[PDB]
Symmetry: C3
């Protein structure tokens, strides 16, 4: 039997919002040490992976590994239901045919209970993360979001280029071209706006804007985004939660 | 305690037949959500991986993850025992020294119970599947089987070559050479004989016929075989079951 | 509740010694079929992975997957405590805030019980092992240790070069250069000093001596070390235990 208590429903809700514009469908693997989930899109160029630890919950009980398949749009529609600060409990049994979502408020006037029908989804969980990436950097989610949103105006392809103490984002299309150049530093006024870079080898990669736009949606979950780039594998964009993380693996373009 | 009920023993039997001409020995990992197993051959150029879900069983109970090591030849010899349409139950305890295979018939005259001695097998399960493969295609198991069987006559090496809307299988040896060229289409007479191709980048790969011959053995498990090819990783041949799959990862030849 | 009995504390102790000069911190994942653990260093060029099976213990009970985070230096300091041949029991509950280490002697005069405070460590377990490595070889731990220790004198970079029936270790620095060349053979006087090589493709790789020095620390756990090399991935150094293994994944240098 699964029983998982979110302090704020907003967390789970916006976590799912994190990867709306979505990879449709997803397998939520719940276990004693918390919840994990991953899903690929139709084109199979973007993998979304999610880990939510126990500490991220107000409360949590499983004692029996349980897999929960469900369509994100249905879940989202169900997740649109409430004050957005309720206590939210996920409930399931030993052989779940359906999952229960339970919203409770400050008092006990409005008790909302929804039941979402589960699904069967075959899925070999992918482990495509690598040991060492050619370059590693991190910056404010908002800044990155802004860069992507701005540059995505000009082209459907954004080129990220990293060299010694230099991070260059470039877009080149029909109407024109644009380039944002940022440089690492330590902001001691408040380190949350700091920009970090660590380069073992320069990189020159190009990504589809469509997807980056989906990546930056996770800005609503963390102050900082961490990007890991290499030419031998999909780029890794990571947003950290209290105890856990939401990460996106994205494949670059060949030519 | 494990208790797993196959409707038809033929399924499990032919599943094991799927990877006879075998990767010798194998670790069957049984858990609440079903069974998984994988094994590599002596040369370590071919990985066989297997997932059997709960729905694929007539019945199934575990409630405690259990690993079952066993030699395929012994198991096969035991699996040769019965009408081939019996109800087949796999039974194990909490600390299994041996596994029980139980065959029962339509009535209750012939009750057959076999006990297979288990084995200790250290094995780091491999996760070599990739997010995106350069090319993806699918076709009738029989057709592919026929192509392999035919071309394997001429050489010990079969070259698969994929370009825009063109799938080319080639063999070149001493006596002569042979090439089968197939093209994608949508068969509306009945889509089971359809041929699908999806190319993000052309490919030119060469495989050992010895192994492909072992791959095509899984034709007895599905109408269609799905092939995923790339130059950066082992090719992936997949046969789908009702709830689960049998897949083969095969390494191409360098030169 | 976890309860794991080592016959000799020396095993566990020296296992941790195996990867001191350490990857700091580590997540010990305990489960019904035994214990696994892995950890990366600060530079993220060296992954240490550990599997300890049930047979390696004098006794073992879990029946509930439990994760145990802990600093290696603290653990080591605690592991310095005892005759070094005590019976050593690891104990934990269902929601461990701390782990118990219990040392008992031949009689029952000195009963030593230590409690180590656990930690929360987010960690996506890496699965970077590959199916086929370009070259595979194995040799006495002592010999390899000696080669590394000797050649590390001259430079901070050791080049391993493998060709047909030829294994060449080279170091080149300021004071001078050095090269050790070994050749495969079958030692029938006693096969433990034998040297094995298996080459599918020649290799020319260079590693940081700093790390190799950390790798060879595991010589105190096995008679033989097994090295698997390829250019497409981190090199794999493996020391085998009774039931389980300690392995190191190391990334070569680009230029």
């Amino acid at each position: 039997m699964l029983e998982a208590k979110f302090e704020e429903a907003s967390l789970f809700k916006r976590i799912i919002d994190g990867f709306k514009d979505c990879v449709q469908l997803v397998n939520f693997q719940c276990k004693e040490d918390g919840i994990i989930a991953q899903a690929v899109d139709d084109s199979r160029v973007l993998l979304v992976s999610l880990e939510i630890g126990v500490e991220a919950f107000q409360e949590y009980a499983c004692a029996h590994p349980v897999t929960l398949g469900m369509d994100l749009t249905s879940l989202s529609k169900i997740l649109r239901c409430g004050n957005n600060t309720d206590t939210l409990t996920l409930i399931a049994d030993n052989t779940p045919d359906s999952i229960i979502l339970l919203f409770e408020d400050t008092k006990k006037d409005r008790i909302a209970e929804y039941s979402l029908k589960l699904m069967d989804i075959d899925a070999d969980f992918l482990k495509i993360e690598e040991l060492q990436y050619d370059s590693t950097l991190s910056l404010p989610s908002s800044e990155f979001s802004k860069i992507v949103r701005d540059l995505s105006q000009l082209s459907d392809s954004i080129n990220i280029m990293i060299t010694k103490e230099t991070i260059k984002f470039v877009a080149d299309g029909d109407i024109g071209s644009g380039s944002v150049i940022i440089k690492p530093f330590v902001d001691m006024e408040h380190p949350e706006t700091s920009i970090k870079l660590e380069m073992d080898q320069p990189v020159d990669l190009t990504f589809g804007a469509k997807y980056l736009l989906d990546i930056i949606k996770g800005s609503s979950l963390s102050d900082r985004v961490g990007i890991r780039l290499s030419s031998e594998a999909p780029a890794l964009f990571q947003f950290d939660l209290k105890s856990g993380f939401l990460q996106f693996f994205l494949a670059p373009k060949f030519n």
